């Protein structure tokens, strides 16, 4: 039954920079991690946006429109947990 030990954190980031959100979850079975941005499932297929190992979402060449609420969703056949943070690109 999943619990998020460390969700994403609030950040101010620079335009063109690379930032990440990380989401450290435990539970059995191991929680899968999903990202929403502003309520919509993030598209890790824009090529700026990468899902890396260890529950890291990485966003390269940050744009002003990447500002928003980012939510980590940690899911298990038992249940799910949630933790969000606000990112400001400037």
């Amino acid at each position: 039954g999943p619990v998020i030990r460390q969700g994403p954190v609030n950040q101010t980031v620079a335009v063109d920079g690379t930032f990440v959100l990380s989401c450290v979850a435990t539970g059995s079975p191991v929680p899968t991690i999903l990202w929403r941005k502003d309520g919509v499932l993030v598209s890790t297929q824009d090529s700026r946006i990468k899902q890396l190992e260890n529950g890291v979402l990485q966003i390269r060449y940050a744009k002003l429109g990447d500002t928003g609420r980012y939510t980590c969703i940690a899911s298990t056949p038992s249940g799910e947990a949630t933790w969000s943070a606000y990112i400001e690109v400037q």
Partner: antibody
Amino acid sequence: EVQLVESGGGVVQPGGSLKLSCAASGFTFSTYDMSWVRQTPDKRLELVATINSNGGSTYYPDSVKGRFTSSRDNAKNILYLQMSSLKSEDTAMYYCAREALLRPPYYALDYWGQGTSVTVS
Amino acid sequence: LDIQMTQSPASLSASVGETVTITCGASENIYGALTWYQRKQGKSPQLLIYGAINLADDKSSRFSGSGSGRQYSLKISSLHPDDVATYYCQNVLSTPFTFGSGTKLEIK
């Protein structure tokens, strides 16, 4: 056979200006993000520019932001770095490097040129 | 505010056939987003390890990358004279993509 050849290095005066070129061949240059990395005389390394495959996006760290401009010619397969307002700390070997396509897709540089020397004073 | 990478030792000399560990510490958790480069004298760096733990294509299995959180290791098993180089780690989590200052490996 992947090849990267930097040129355009030399000795310049403080506040001066230089433009480096990197000729690429042996790969589909228009597909790859490219970086410029420099190596100072103390042997430390520093990423100074990245540019994505179509030239649409560029990144520079604070140490060079405002002074360095990266651009590419995808038809002739050349990467450029215009450097201006140069300072003695900019003295370094400059490499152009290819960003690797990987899984997971961590940023990493798989092919590097042999570099071109820049000296400021 | 930028992520510091500290490498140890700064240099070392070891003998042929020895196994040698080089360490890289980050000032915050970097989640395996680390890469290792090898630079031989008068040459440009080459990719060794990506994502902390993945060996690059045409590189010897004598090299292995390990670690997690803030602590990473590059191990060189069965030291060979061609391993003479400076080894560098790089933070590839968030910009600036800072490099450790390098570990120079010599043969006695």
